[PDB]
Design a protein around this ligand. Structure first.
Ligand code: HEC
Ligand SMILES: [Zn+2]
Ligand SMILES: [Zn+2]
Length: 107
């Protein structure tokens, strides 16, 4: 299950693995992937002005720390048909660290 990790390690993981396709700040632009502001507590496939796949919308997951960890373990396994071209974060340490950071960065 999800447990709070290191947000500093999380921020680096975000910069090096996620930032190329995602912004986190309020009003931040959409890039290859949607801006993630307010992602926790919002259903999947609902960021304003972003064109998602039917699969992402269909999943209809209410994003929380635990399901985000499961999704980030392997995105294509959790949401079959996703256009998010990312293999996943295989270490639970990395997922805990990234999510601790993301919970704050996207608030
Ligand atoms: C580009 C090559 C991407 C990288 C690198 C990462 N993400 Fe991604 N993500 C991307 C796209 C194109 C999409 C839309 C997928 C679709 O099928 O429509 C996404 C989506 C997400 C989501 C869900 C958004 C939502 O439901 O509103 C999340 C939570 C997400 N991406 C997180 C995320 C993180 C934390 C990553 C780094 C570890 C990451 N993404 C990398 C494209 C790309
Ligand atoms: Zn719901
Ligand atoms: Zn906010």
């Amino acid at each position: 299950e999800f447990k709070a990790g290191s947000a500093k390690k999380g921020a680096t993981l975000f910069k090096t693995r996620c930032l190329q396709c995602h912004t986190v700040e309020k009003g931040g632009p959409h890039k290859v992937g949607p801006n993630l502001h307010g992602i926790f507590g919002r259903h999947s496939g609902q960021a304003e002005g972003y064109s998602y796949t039917d699969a992402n919308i269909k999943k209809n997951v209410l994003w929380d720390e635990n399901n985000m960890s499961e999704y980030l373990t392997n995105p294509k396994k959790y949401i079959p048909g996703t256009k998010m071209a990312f293999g996943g974060l295989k270490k639970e340490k990395d997922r805990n660290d990234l999510i601790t950071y993301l919970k704050k960065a996207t608030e």
